[PDB]
Amino acid sequence: GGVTTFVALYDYESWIETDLSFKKGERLQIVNNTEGNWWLAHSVTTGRTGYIPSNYVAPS
């Protein structure tokens, strides 16, 4: 629901077109949701926005 800043725990490479790539340690602003583990995220590093798998991140 809200926005929180998360940190990536592992590298991740976009491969479903709508997902966002990131590197371990990268900070992501994320809107969590309860429908599943794909969350809409925004990289403060790259400026890009897209879905991430929530098991790859943790709150900062």
Author numbering: 81 to 140
Sentences from the paper on this structure:
Cellular Src kinase (c-Src) is one of the most representative members of the Src-family kinases (SFKs), a group of non­receptor tyrosine kinases that mediate responses to extracellular stimuli, phosphorylating a broad range of downstream substrates. Although v-Src shares 95% sequence identity with c-Src, this kinase shows uncontrollable activity that is responsible for the occurrence of sarcoma in chickens. A number of these mutations are located in the SH3 domain, which plays a critical role in enzyme function by facilitating the interaction with partner proteins and providing the formation of the closed inactive conformation of the kinase. Here, the crystal structures of three SH3-domain mutants of v-Src were determined to unveil the effects of these oncogenic mutations in this regulatory domain.
In this way, in order to stabilize the domain and to be able to crystallize the protein, we introduced a Gln128Arg mutation in the distal loop (v-Src SH3 Q128R; c-Src SH3 R95W-T96I-D117N-L124V-Q128R). The v-Src SH3 Q128R mutant was stable enough to allow biophysical studies and to be crystallized. Even with this stabilizing mutation, the protein was still very prone to aggregation, forming amyloid-like aggregates. The type of β-turn in the RT loop is also different from that found in v-Src SH3 N117D-V124L. In this case, residues Ile96–Asp99 form a type IV β-turn with a hydrogen bond between Ile96 N and the Asp99 side chain. Besides the RT loop mutations, the v-Src SH3 Q128R variant also bears oncogenic mutations in the n-Src and distal loops at Asn117 and Val124. Asn117 interacts with Ser134 in the 310-helix, and a hydrogen bond between Asn112 and Gly81 also reduces the flexibility of the amino-terminal region. In c-Src SH3 the amino-terminal region is usually disordered, but in v-Src SH3 Q128R residues Gly81–Leu89 form an extended β1 strand. In addition to the low solvent content, in v-Src SH3 Q128R a PEG molecule and a sulfate ion facilitate the packing between protein molecules in the crystal.
